[PDB]
C-alpha cells in the first residue's frame, strides 16, 4: 500500500515541490508529516499549496525571467 502526498519543497529522490508523489505510509506518517515536508493529497491542502506557491513563485518568476 502507498500514499499520495504533495511536496512542499525539493526532496532529492522524490521530486520538485508542488508535485504529488507516492510514498510509504511509515515514511509519510513519521517523517514528512511532522516536518511539514509533505501534505496529504486531499482537496483543501492541494488548493492551499497551489495558491501559496502561485503567489510566491509569481515573484520568483518575475525575478528570474527578466
Amino acid at each position: 500500500r502507498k500514499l499520495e502526498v504533495i511536496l512542499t519543497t525539493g526532496i532529492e529522490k522524490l521530486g520538485k515541490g508542488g508535485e504529488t508523489v507516492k510514498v510509504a505510509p511509515g515514511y509519510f506518517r513519521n517523517h514528512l508529516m511532522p516536518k511539514l515536508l509533505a501534505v496529504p493529497n486531499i482537496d483543501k491542502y492541494a488548493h492551499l499549496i497551489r495558491e501559496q506557491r502561485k503567489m510566491r513563485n509569481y515573484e520568483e518568476v518575475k525575478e528570474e525571467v527578466k
Binding site: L3, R29, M33, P34, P40, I42, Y45, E59, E63
Partner: protein, 177 residues
C-alpha cells in the same frame, strides 16, 4: 446496553433540561453514540469500533473445546495534529490507524467522522475541540510581502535583536555592579 440513554442523561444534566426544545432533543438523540462498548480501556482510546471477543479453542484430533479470547491490535502512538502543531499520544488500533491514513490525518478524521461513530465521550470532546479550532481558523487571512519588504523587515529584526542583546547585557552587568 442503553449507552445512548446514559450519555444523554449526563449531557442533559450538564446543560440544563430547560435549555433544549423538543426538536433539539430529537436531534441530540441522533448524535449521542449508541454502540456496544463494555471493556474499560476502549473508552480511553481510539479503537474505531474494535472490541474483544471470547470464543472456543478446539483441539485437532479430540475436538476438545476450551475458552479463549481475541484482542484488538492496540498500539500506543503519537499522531501529529495540524492545528495544535504538536503530537497527540493515543492508544489506537491498526484499523483506526488505517482509517486515519485514508482520511488524511487525525484532525481530518475527527472532522469527517460523525458524532455517532465517535463511540466515546472523549471522542465527542476531541471532535468538538478540533471543530471549534477549525471554525476559529476559518475567519483568518494572511498577507505576504515583496522581497524588498523581506529585506527591510529582516534588517529591522536584526537591529532589534542586537539592541535587545546589548541592553540585556548592560542590565546584567549593572545589576552585577
Amino acid at each position: 446496553a442503553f449507552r445512548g440513554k446514559e450519555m444523554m442523561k449526563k449531557l442533559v444534566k450538564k446543560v440544563g433540561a430547560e435549555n433544549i426544545t423538543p426538536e433539539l432533543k430529537e436531534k441530540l438523540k441522533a448524535c449521542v453514540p449508541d454502540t456496544k462498548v463494555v471493556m474499560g480501556r476502549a473508552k480511553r482510546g481510539l479503537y474505531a469500533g474494535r472490541h474483544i471477543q471470547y470464543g472456543n479453542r478446539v483441539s485437532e484430533d479430540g475436538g476438545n473445546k476450551s475458552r479463549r479470547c481475541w484482542k484488538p491490535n492496540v498500539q500506543e502512538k503519537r499522531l501529529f495534529s495540524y492545528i495544535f502543531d504538536s503530537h497527540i499520544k493515543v492508544k489506537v488500533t491498526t484499523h483506526a490507524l488505517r482509517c486515519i491514513d485514508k482520511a488524511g490525518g487525525i484532525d481530518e478524521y475527527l472532522l469527517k467522522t460523525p458524532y455517532q461513530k465517535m463511540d466515546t465521550e472523549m471522542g465527542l470532546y476531541w471532535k468538538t475541540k478540533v471543530e471549534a479550532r477549525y471554525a476559529e481558523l476559518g475567519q483568518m487571512e494572511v498577507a505576504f510581502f515583496n522581497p524588498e519588504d523581506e529585506a527591510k523587515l529582516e534588517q529591522g529584526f536584526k537591529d532589534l535583536n542586537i539592541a535587545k542583546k546589548d541592553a540585556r547585557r548592560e542590565a546584567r552587568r549593572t545589576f552585577r555592579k
